[PDB]
RNA sequence: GGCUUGUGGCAGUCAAGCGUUCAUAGCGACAUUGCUUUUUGAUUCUUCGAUGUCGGCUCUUCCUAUCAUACCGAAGCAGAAU
RNA sequence: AAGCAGAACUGGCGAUGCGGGAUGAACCGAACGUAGAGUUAAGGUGCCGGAAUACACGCUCAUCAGACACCACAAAAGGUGUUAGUUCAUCUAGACAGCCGGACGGUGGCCAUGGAAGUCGGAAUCCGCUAAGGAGUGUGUAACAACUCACCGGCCGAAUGAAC
């Protein structure tokens, strides 16, 4: 309860000084992406996060002085965080949502759409051919590099990506999904 | 000794010229009769004080009846016993109607579960757990449920006859 | 079209359960369960029949299908007044269990002249029953 | 101590005792299991051992090196005139 | 044709197991005690040795 | 420790009728019927409100309370198998010799035959249990699907076909040939 | 090559040491009795862990040497050489005999054993509270090299001293404790006051 | 023949190490707990008004601490052979 | 070491039956004229077998149970079998499980290596950011890469874990 002792005081230390709270979601974005959001915005906006029931118990122990924080009481749900700002809404929205494409897709996740590889010169050494050969992708060597013969679809919609078949996707640097920092709620007085 | 009896035993050193009126040590002893109660009293003063039966006297022995023998009392018993390889301190809880019947239950349970005898058991303390939620053991706490109701399935009936003519049932 | 589960109704060890003491000094008197010591031990009170308020083993006690309202730990005066309010003794005497107990003690109380009379009356009833068997 | 050298047992213990038979006509201690769908037939016959002789026949055994080759084989001849049925016996089943 | 997904399916039953250090029993891969009485349900286990 | 009362909960959906005698359970739903004799358990079943059935143990130890949750799971497996069914999907794994699995009829016995398992001239046969429907799935290579009302018979039949294709006197880490269970699910789940 | 320890387990004979009447005892297999940080100050290592025998028996010098090696090896591997001071608290003074008919059967010296008692300390380790589990595991791994039953007991004394942790603390904020090579010397209320000023000058404040 | 088990034989526990890497696939030091009575010691209880003595041959049966064969598990088990 | 050899005190056997230890010189009880009655000792009371398939609290299920005072055997070491307990820690200020998310930057940290980038290794093991992420918990590569863990966070919904 020692870390909670400072965390509750810091939470009220940002609720009472920052005039705008922005409830932001976090689903598949990395620590690297939180680090670059920090480095993209130091001073303009503050990212406080660490979603738990720490937040709900803190805010409902702060509804003693301000009964306007009960709107936030249902919205603390999902893997979520808070942003404390003073700057306009359509600028803080743009700065925290402008960074979508993170690290490439991980093997074993459910790809929503169908992932497909095109019949264009890939651009790596012809030694990395067993990745194309494992999936059945037709392959010719053109100008000392792999060119694909046909536009083959490697996984269909609503299917898991295979551990064997995510390697040529990692080499080709096609990642159809990693997504960025999404928002869920805006708070104004 | 189907029932234990709890006695108070008060003893002291023999009064001397330099020290008259010795300090009158008193204990609560569980035993079957006054002979064992006096023996257990001098056994524990050999464990506590520089005194024995020859250097001391028994000034009073009285039987303590239970104050309310008709009410059901949760008991906490602190006990020290010797195992085959050491000495161990133990706390047990007994839901029982008196102190002497709780000490009977403790001695039966200690001999059953640890193969420890009256020879090898020291009763450090018997106390009443006066309120619920100071009861620590689940086997006692399960009887403290509100309006507790349970059946007794598979009733086995003892006949007085060698032979029966009915193929008896175990209903209840 | 219906779920069918056999309930298998059982006599419960409960506060307010009227019991018959089959072994000991009481030996056929009625008592009521006031507390539950443990799985096999209870506290009983039989003030109408003179049973002392005592903690007893459930082995030497048989439960009756009778029950009545009684608070937990009720003292002897409270057990007496709620026993008479529920009228336990009349509901006990109406049962075929207690009818059979009274019949077997009256048979043991029969004398030799009365056993002659019951044999004469059994022959008189038997002649009528066998006559009605033949007519039916 | 042990035999120091071990050889198989001399004789079969399942044919004990090596005593005389209780009758000259050996008894059929087991019959084929009854298949009730088949027509009624005899399971055994009585005969008298006349003697032995040899035959020659062609062996039909593929894989054998005497496939489609003549073999000389000893045969026993049993004289079996037709048996006369004179009775019938019924057998009930008992826990004994 | 090896089909590494089918190879992983067959490795779940043949390869991804544990071995009791006393009675050599093939055990579930995250078991704590061996299921055999003859070793005393010992907690001394080890992973099955992977091929290459 | 002899817990005074330990009870577990069975939920009965609308299309399911559950009639239980002493310890003979009979569950009838839209898919079929399932009977099971639990006379080795010594529990007590009570019906509450025609959609909910409790099962209880009075004065039970550790092993006897542990059997109570097993009994509730077996009855729940009955209801799952009589309104959703059970579907086991199995895949053929081999390296060189293709496994040939078909359905055969000898004296009307409904056997599953396996030929060319690791190039064996021996024909492996496993019986299909009654109430188990065998199909070979389309648009997936080398897949056999076993379906039925009982998870016990479906899983035992799937395990019988898996264990009939075991490898002897070879490194089974290398020789991974056989028919293995890859999925356990329900029939009418969408 | 050596007769098993089951022949010399129990104290069956009278204590038989090396003396002028024996004079031909072989050397003991245990020679090092203090290990680790044996130059540490008393304040450095407050926690004490004991390996205490529960049986009246004999511990051979080969068993004492083997248990020293394995206990010191494990504590050096995990916590380091200088994180502890392992002291062994029994010495193999008793001499075991071997008789290699029964005429003239008096035996020749075979080996050395340490006669122990119920509750006697075999091993003692003083260390910090940081590696209580490392010391306990090292002592219980040395337990396997001994016959009989042994116990791991956390001493409530301060280090290898005879004072409890609060009693030594109260003596330490006062000037009644002065340090030494590896032990400490305590001020008494007796003796020459001139000496009692020369040592312990922080007392008398 | 009986008692004992130092010695012989056969097991186990711990795990410093060997095993290219890795204590325990296979081993396993320093220690230590056992079992057996097919070794040899130790004893002198029975037999000196005699229990025919070593070995081999012959033949039967028994034990398992299993060389082969049956069915299996593990490997530093690819196959084969182990 | 021995049902081995040798001493001290006493009690026994020898020299002695009787009841009990199935059986036995020495153990337990008790020592003995011939009988009757009663009561007991040691030992026992399912049946053999005289005597409670007595009462009461618990423990144990052994695909080698156990029921052995002398005495006719068993050990170290172990077992989420089950029972009882000691100590410490976490948890509704949502604890342990399961499943899902993320596990970064300086930096391929300093050396030493043929090459070892967190994972052959030696010594250090600090702050930046965060809820959090080791100069690394494992699988891997020659080195990479990649996967995984500690560490935190989605979910419920109540106690849990460890050493003994
Ligand atoms: Mg032989
Ligand atoms: Mg092979
Ligand atoms: Mg001696
Ligand atoms: Mg002769
Ligand atoms: Mg003589
Ligand atoms: Mg006798
Ligand atoms: Mg005997
Ligand atoms: Mg009798």
UniProtKB/Swiss-Prot annotation, chain A:
Keywords: Cytoplasm, Isopeptide bond, Phosphoprotein, Ribonucleoprotein, Ribosomal protein, Ubl conjugation. It comes from the Eukaryota. GO terms for cellular component: 90S preribosome; cytoplasm; cytosolic large ribosomal subunit. It is found in: Cytoplasm. The keyword Cytoplasm applies. Its main location: cytoplasm. One of its GO terms (molecular function) is large ribosomal subunit rRNA binding. Component of the large ribosomal subunit (LSU). Mature yeast ribosomes consist of a small (40S) and a large (60S) subunit. The 40S small subunit contains 1 molecule of ribosomal RNA (18S rRNA) and 33 different proteins (encoded by 57 genes). The large 60S subunit contains 3 rRNA molecules (25S, 5.8S and 5S rRNA) and 46 different proteins (encoded by 81 genes). The 5 acidic ribosomal P-proteins form the stalk structure of the 60S subunit. They are organized as a pentameric complex in which uL10/P0 interacts with 2 heterodimers, P1A-P2B and P1B-P2A. uL10 directly interacts with 28S rRNA. This is Large ribosomal subunit protein uL10. It comes from Saccharomyces cerevisiae (strain ATCC 204508 / S288c). The lineage of its organism: Eukaryota, Fungi, Dikarya, Ascomycota, Saccharomycotina. The gene is RPP0. The chain holds residues 5 to 193 of 312 of the full protein.
Curated annotation (Swiss-Prot), chain D:
It is found in: Cytoplasm. There is a cross-link at residue 38 (Glycyl lysine isopeptide (Lys-Gly) (interchain with G-Cter in ubiquitin)). It comes from the Eukaryota. Transmembrane segments: none annotated. Disruption phenotype: A mutant confers resistance to trichodermin, a trichotecene toxin produced by plant-pathogenic fungi. The modification Phosphoserine is found at residue 23. Belongs to the universal ribosomal protein uL3 family. Component of the large ribosomal subunit (LSU). Mature yeast ribosomes consist of a small (40S) and a large (60S) subunit. The 40S small subunit contains 1 molecule of ribosomal RNA (18S rRNA) and 33 different proteins (encoded by 57 genes). The large 60S subunit contains 3 rRNA molecules (25S, 5.8S and 5S rRNA) and 46 different proteins (encoded by 81 genes). uL3 forms together with ES39L one of the contact sites for the signal recognition particle that targets ribosomes to the endoplasmic reticulum membrane. Present with 450 molecules/cell in log phase SD medium. This is Large ribosomal subunit protein uL3. It comes from Saccharomyces cerevisiae (strain ATCC 204508 / S288c). The gene is RPL3.
From Swiss-Prot, chain E:
This is Large ribosomal subunit protein eL40A. There is a cross-link at residue 17 (Glycyl lysine isopeptide (Lys-Gly) (interchain with G-Cter in ubiquitin)). It comes from Saccharomyces cerevisiae (strain ATCC 204508 / S288c) (Baker's yeast). Signal peptide: none annotated. It is found in: Cytoplasm. The gene is RPL40A. Component of the large ribosomal subunit (LSU). Mature yeast ribosomes consist of a small (40S) and a large (60S) subunit. The 40S small subunit contains 1 molecule of ribosomal RNA (18S rRNA) and 33 different proteins (encoded by 57 genes). The large 60S subunit contains 3 rRNA molecules (25S, 5.8S and 5S rRNA) and 46 different proteins (encoded by 81 genes). Component of the ribosome, a large ribonucleoprotein complex responsible for the synthesis of proteins in the cell. The small ribosomal subunit (SSU) binds messenger RNAs (mRNAs) and translates the encoded message by selecting cognate aminoacyl-transfer RNA (tRNA) molecules. The large subunit (LSU) contains the ribosomal catalytic site termed the peptidyl transferase center (PTC), which catalyzes the formation of peptide bonds, thereby polymerizing the amino acids delivered by tRNAs into a polypeptide chain. It comes from the Eukaryota.
UniProtKB/Swiss-Prot annotation, chain F:
It comes from the Eukaryota. Keywords: Cytoplasm, Ribonucleoprotein, Ribosomal protein. SUPFAM superfamilies: Ribosomal protein L6. It is found in: Cytoplasm. GO terms for cellular component: cytosol; cytosolic large ribosomal subunit. One of its GO terms (molecular function) is structural constituent of ribosome. Pfam families: Ribosomal_L6 (PF00347). GO terms for biological process: cytoplasmic translation. Present with 52400 molecules/cell in log phase SD medium. There are 2 genes for uL6 in yeast. Component of the large ribosomal subunit (LSU). Mature yeast ribosomes consist of a small (40S) and a large (60S) subunit. The 40S small subunit contains 1 molecule of ribosomal RNA (18S rRNA) and 33 different proteins (encoded by 57 genes). The large 60S subunit contains 3 rRNA molecules (25S, 5.8S and 5S rRNA) and 46 different proteins (encoded by 81 genes). uL6 lines the binding pocket for eukaryotic elongation factor 2 (eEF2). PANTHER family: 60S RIBOSOMAL PROTEIN L9, 60S/50S RIBOSOMAL PROTEIN L6/L9. Belongs to the universal ribosomal protein uL6 family. This is Large ribosomal subunit protein uL6A. The gene is RPL9A.
């Amino acid at each position: 309860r020692e870390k909670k002792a400072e965390y509750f005081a810091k939470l009220r230390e940002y609720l009472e000084e920052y005039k705008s709270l922005f409830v932001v979601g976090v689903d598949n974005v990395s620590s690297q992406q939180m680090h670059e959001v920090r480095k993209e915005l130091r001073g303009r906006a503050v990212v406080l996060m660490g979603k738990n029931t720490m937040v709900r118990r803190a805010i409902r122990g702060f509804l003693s002085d301000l009964p306007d924080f009960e709107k936030l009481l249902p919205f603390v749900k999902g893997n979520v965080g808070f942003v404390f700002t003073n700057e306009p809404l359509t600028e803080i929205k743009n700065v925290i949502v402008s960074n979508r494409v993170a690290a490439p897709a991980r093997a074993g996740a459910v790809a929503p759409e169908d992932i497909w590889v095109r019949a264009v010169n890939t651009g790596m050494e012809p030694g990395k051919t067993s990745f194309f050969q494992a999936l059945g992708v037709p392959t010719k060597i053109a100008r000392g590099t792999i060119e694909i013969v046909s536009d083959v679809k490697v996984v269909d919609a609503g299917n898991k990506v295979g551990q064997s078949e995510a390697s040529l996707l990692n080499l080709l640097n096609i990642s159809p999904f990693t997504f960025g920092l999404t928002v869920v709620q805006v708070y104004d007085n | 000794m189907a029932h234990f009896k709890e006695y108070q035993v008060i003893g002291r050193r023999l009064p001397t010229e330099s020290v008259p009126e010795p300090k009158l040590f008193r204990m609560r002893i569980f035993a079957s009769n006054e002979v064992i109660a006096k023996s257990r009293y001098w056994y524990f003063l050999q464990k506590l004080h520089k005194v024995k039966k020859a250097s001391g006297e028994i000034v009073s022995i009285n039987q303590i009846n239970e104050a309310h023998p008709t009410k059901v009392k949760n008991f906490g018993v602190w006990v020290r016993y010797d195992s085959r390889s050491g000495t161990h301190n133990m706390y047990k809880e007994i839901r029982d109607v008196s102190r002497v019947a709780a000490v009977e239950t403790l001695y039966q349970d200690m001999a059953a579960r640890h193969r420890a005898r009256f020879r090898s058991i020291h009763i450090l303390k018997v106390a009443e757990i006066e309120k619920t939620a100071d009861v620590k053991r689940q086997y006692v706490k399960q009887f403290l449920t509100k309006d507790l109701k349970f059946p007794l399935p598979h009733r086995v009936q003892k006949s007085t006859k060698t032979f029966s003519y009915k193929r008896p049932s175990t209903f209840y | 079209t219906d779920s069918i589960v056999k309930a298998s109704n059982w006599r419960l060890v409960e506060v307010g359960r009227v019991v018959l003491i089959k072994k000991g000094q009481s030996a056929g008197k009625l008592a009521a369960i006031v507390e539950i010591i443990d799985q096999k031990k209870v506290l009983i009170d039989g003030p109408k029949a003179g049973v002392p308020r005592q903690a007893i083993n459930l082995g030497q006690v048989v439960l009756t299908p009778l029950t009545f309202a009684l608070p937990r730990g009720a003292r002897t005066a409270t057990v007496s007044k709620k026993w008479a309010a529920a009228a336990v003794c009349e509901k006990w005497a109406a049962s075929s269990w207690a009818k059979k107990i009274a019949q077997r003690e009256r048979r043991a109380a029969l004398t030799d002249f009365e056993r002659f009379q019951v044999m004469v009356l059994r022959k008189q009833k038997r002649y009528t029953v066998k006559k009605a068997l033949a007519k039916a | 101590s042990h035999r120091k050298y071990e050889a198989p047992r001399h004789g079969h213990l399942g044919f004990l005792p090596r005593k005389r038979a209780a009758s000259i006509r050996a008894r059929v201690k087991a019959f084929p299991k009854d298949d009730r769908s088949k027509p009624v037939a005899l399971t055994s016959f009585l005969g008298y051992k006349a003697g032995m002789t040899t035959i020659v026949r062609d062996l039909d055994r593929p894989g054998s090196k005497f496939h489609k080759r003549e073999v000389v084989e000893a045969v026993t001849v049993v004289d079996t005139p037709p048996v006369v049925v004179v009775g019938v016996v019924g057998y009930v089943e008992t826990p004994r | 044709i090896i089909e590494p997904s089918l190879k992983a399916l067959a490795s779940k039953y043949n390869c991804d197991k544990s071995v009791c250090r006393k009675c050599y029993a093939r055990l579930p891969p995250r078991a704590t005690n061996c299921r055999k009485r003859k070793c005393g349900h010992t907690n001394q286990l080890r992973p099955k040795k992977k091929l290459k | 420790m002899k817990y005074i009362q330990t009870e577990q909960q069975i939920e009965v959906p609308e299309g399911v009728t559950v009639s239980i005698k002493s310890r003979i359970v009979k569950v009838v739903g839209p898919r079929g019927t399932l009977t099971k004799n639990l006379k080795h358990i010594d529990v007590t079943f009570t019906k509450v409100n025609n959609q909910l059935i409790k099962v209880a143990v009075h004065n039970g130890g550790r092993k006897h309370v542990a059997a109570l949750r097993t009994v509730k799971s077996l009855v729940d497996n009955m209801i799952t198998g009589v309104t959703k069914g059970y579907k086991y999907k199995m895949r053929y794994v081999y390296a060189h010799f293709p496994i040939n699995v078909n359905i055969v009829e000898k004296d009307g016995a409904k056997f599953i035959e396996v030929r060319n398992f690791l190039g064996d001239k021996k024909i492996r046969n496993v019986p299909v249990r009654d109430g188990v429907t065998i199909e070979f799935s389309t648009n997936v290579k080398d897949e056999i699907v076993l379906s039925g009302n009982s998870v016990e018979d479906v899983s035992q039949n799937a395990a019988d076909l898996q264990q009939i294709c075991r490898v002897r006197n070879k490194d089974i880490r290398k020789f991974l040939d056989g028919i293995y269970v890859s999925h356990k699910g329900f029939i009418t789940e969408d | 090559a050596r007769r098993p320890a089951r022949c010399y387990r129990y104290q069956k004979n009278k204590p038989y040491p090396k003396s002028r009447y024996n004079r031909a005892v072989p050397d003991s297999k245990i020679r090092i009795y203090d290990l680790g940080k044996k130059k540490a100050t008393v304040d450095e290592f407050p926690l004490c862990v004991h390996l205490v025998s529960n049986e009246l028996e004999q511990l051979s010098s080969e068993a004492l040497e083997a248990a020293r090696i394995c206990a010191n090896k494990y504590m050096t591997t995990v916590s380091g050489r200088d994180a502890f001071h392992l002291r062994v608290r029994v010495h193999p003074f008793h001499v075991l005999r071997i008789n290699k008919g029964m005429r003239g059967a008096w035996g020749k010296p075979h080996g050395l054993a340490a006669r122990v008692d119920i509750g006697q300390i075999i091993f003692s380790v003083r260390t910090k509270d940081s590696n209580k589990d490392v010391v306990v595991e090292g002592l219980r791994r040395a337990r396997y090299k001994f016959p009989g039953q042994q116990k791991i007991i956390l001493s409530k004394k301060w280090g290898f001293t005879n004072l409890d942790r609060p009693e030594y603390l109260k003596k330490r904020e006062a000037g009644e404790v002065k340090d030494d090579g590896a032990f400490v010397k305590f001020l008494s209320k007796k003796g020459s006051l001139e000496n009692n000023i020369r040592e312990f000058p922080e007392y008398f404040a």
